[PDB]
Design a binder for this molecule. Structure first.
Ligand SMILES: *[C@@H]1O[C@H](CO)[C@@H](O[C@@H]2O[C@H](CO)[C@@H](O)[C@H](O)[C@H]2NC(C)=O)[C@H](O)[C@H]1NC(C)=O
Ligand SMILES: *[C@@H]1O[C@H](CO)[C@@H](O[C@@H]2O[C@H](CO)[C@@H](O)[C@H](O)[C@H]2NC(C)=O)[C@H](O)[C@H]1NC(C)=O
Ligand SMILES: *[C@@H]1O[C@H](CO)[C@@H](O)[C@H](O)[C@H]1NC(C)=O
Ligand SMILES: *[C@@H]1O[C@H](CO)[C@@H](O)[C@H](O)[C@H]1NC(C)=O
Ligand SMILES: *[C@@H]1O[C@H](CO)[C@@H](O)[C@H](O)[C@H]1NC(C)=O
Ligand SMILES: *[C@@H]1O[C@H](CO)[C@@H](O)[C@H](O)[C@H]1NC(C)=O
Lengths: 97, 97, 48, 142, 49, 29
């Protein structure tokens, strides 16, 4: 019974020392979390219909009046980008709990 | 006024229970300002555009390169001579920047 | 509708500068004489 | 370079810390882009010296208290901050936070969670009272 | 058992060093505070777990 | 399991540390 147990713990190491993919359930979590932050940084590059995705390109060009109509577009699209991320994370946190 | 006042103000309560309380993120602000434009000793030949004796017919509208020159757009925008002066992805007042 | 305080600002300009009396504008009347706030509430009235 | 400044390159006004770029920019390459599709580097139009832009130092700030009922004394944790970046935080360079009674130091403790100020580090271990992160907690005690 | 704790400065994500954006973002009210209250609730729970 | 991020930070996206370190988790285990 002891030699069986010692041989069964031996195989446990062998398997973990061999295959690349045994912790696929944990890497997934790391992959999901990263992918959601990399998607959230990609949203910043979107115009949402503004003349540029960059506030410095709007402020340097359009005067405050013409600027606010562009800045509002970027605020509206980004706000949703954040809400999306936080809704995905609140749903995903209940899977982890 | 103080960290604790920023927690009272963020919790919306004049009393704070025991525990850690995240507040506004801190951030070092600029010590000075910097401007870096390619040094150009010559200006742009706008007089050879706007005061040229002969304009092109619209069916064969002309196109002139403006290049390697400084453009003072405050002189163009300050002149009351232009009935129309509309900028579509930029603003005339901030062209100088 | 009622109003908390009311003011009338009165002056003479030229027909071509009447566009500068709108809020958020630029040009020598808007910059050196009479500026409206970018959040202006009120009515601009003008006549020949 | 290495200063929080409002730089302006070819009409692009931006706030960041300019720094000589180690990146091997090719002659044609003018600006340098970061994975976030953001400007991590730029070429100086006058003296050709590629510059890495990095944002001026920031982090979360968190306030540790035995609760207003127990006392008003508090300790401050600067999230993800090394202690040397709190001497950098000076009123000369006004920061969003106008208060700065903590930059007086002497109790600036470094946690893996970040720079903690106004709390006295001790060698004794206790049950966790207020959780600071990375194995550290804080409590109000004699 | 847990996942990465994150915090997201709603001002710095939405307004990239723009006071005009800030003064415009203030017209939406509590959104930004509600987003940080949500991510803090997720982050505290990773230690409970 | 192996645990971009700098660019996310440049945009206000930060990761917070767990309360129990991987040494404290190993002491409980
Ligand atoms: C009962 O099963 C055990 C294994 O669970 C057998 O023990 C093995 O015997 C072989 C030789 O026949 C040895 O080489 C192995 O090392 C033994 N197992 C371990 C893990 O040490 C046992 O022989 C079986 N008995 C019968 C009657 O079949
Ligand atoms: C086009 O010509 C007119 C006049 O021929 C120029 O207008 C003058 O501008 C200067 C300032 O640069 C003023 O001091 C003069 O009073 C103006 N004169 C008149 C009669 O208007 C104008 O500058 C020229 N445009 C260009 C691009 O050279
Ligand atoms: C600006 O002047 C400096 C003087 O040394 C020169 O080296 C530089 O090339 C100039 N800027 C431009 C347009 O390259
Ligand atoms: C602490 O709370 C008690 C009630 O629980 C109250 O009577 C007391 O005045 C409080 N002390 C301070 C200084 O807040
Ligand atoms: C802080 O920086 C110093 C550099 O002198 C380094 O030695 C120290 O380990 C750093 N502390 C942490 C953990 O950030
Ligand atoms: C902790 O112990 C070290 C020696 O191991 C000593 O030098 C130090 O002063 C102690 N610190 C505290 C807070 O007691």
């Amino acid at each position: 019974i002891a030699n069986q147990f010692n041989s069964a713990i031996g195989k446990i190491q062998d398997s973990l020392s061999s295959t690349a993919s045994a912790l696929g359930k944990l890497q997934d979590v790391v992959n999901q979390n990263a992918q959601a932050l990399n998607t959230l940084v990609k949203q910043l590059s979107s115009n949402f219909g503004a003349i540029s995705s960059v506030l410095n390109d709007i402020l340097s060009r359009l005067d405050k009046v013409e600027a606010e109509v562009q800045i509002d577009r970027l605020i509206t699209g980004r706000l949703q980008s954040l809400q999306t991320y936080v809704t995905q994370q609140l749903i995903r946190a209940a899977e982890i709990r | 006024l103080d960290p604790l006042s920023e927690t009272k103000c963020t919790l919306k309560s004049f009393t704070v229970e025991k525990g850690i309380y995240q507040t506004s993120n801190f951030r070092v602000q600029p010590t000075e300002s910097i401007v870096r434009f390619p040094n150009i000793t010559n200006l742009c030949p706008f007089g050879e555009v706007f005061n040229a004796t002969r304009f092109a017919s619209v069916y064969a509208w002309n196109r002139k390169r403006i290049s390697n020159c400084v453009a003072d757009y405050s002189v163009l925008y300050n002149s009351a001579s232009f009935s129309t002066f509309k900028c579509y992805g930029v603003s005339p007042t901030k062209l100088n920047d | 509708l009622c109003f908390t305080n009311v003011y009338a600002d009165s002056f003479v300009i030229r027909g071509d500068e009447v566009r500068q009396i709108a809020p958020g504008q630029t040009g020598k009347i808007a910059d050196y004489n009479y500026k409206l706030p970018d959040d202006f509430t009120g009515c601009v009235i003008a006549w020949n | 370079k290495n200063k929080c400044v409002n730089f302006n390159f070819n009409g692009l006004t931006g706030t960041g810390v300019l720094t000589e770029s180690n990146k091997k920019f090719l002659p044609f390459q003018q600006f340098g882009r970061d994975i976030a599709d953001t400007t991590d580097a730029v070429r100086d139009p006058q003296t050709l010296e590629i510059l890495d832009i990095t944002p001026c130092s920031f982090g979360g700030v968190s306030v540790i208290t035995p609760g207003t009922n127990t006392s008003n004394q508090v300790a401050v944790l600067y999230q993800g901050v090394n202690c040397t970046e709190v001497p950098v935080a000076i009123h000369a360079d006004q920061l969003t936070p106008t208060w700065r009674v903590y930059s007086t130091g002497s109790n600036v403790f470094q946690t893996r969670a970040g720079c903690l100020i106004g709390a006295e580090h001790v060698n004794n271990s206790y049950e966790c009272d207020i959780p600071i992160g990375a194995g550290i907690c804080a409590s109000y005690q004699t | 058992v847990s996942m990465t704790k994150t915090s997201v400065d709603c001002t710095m994500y939405i307004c990239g060093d723009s006071t005009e954006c800030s003064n415009l973002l203030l017209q939406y009210g509590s959104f930004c505070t509600q987003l940080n209250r949500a991510l803090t609730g997720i982050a505290v729970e990773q230690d409970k777990n | 399991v192996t645990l971009l991020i700098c660019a996310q930070k440049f945009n206000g996206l930060t990761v917070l540390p767990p309360l129990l370190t991987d040494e404290m988790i190993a002491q409980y285990t």
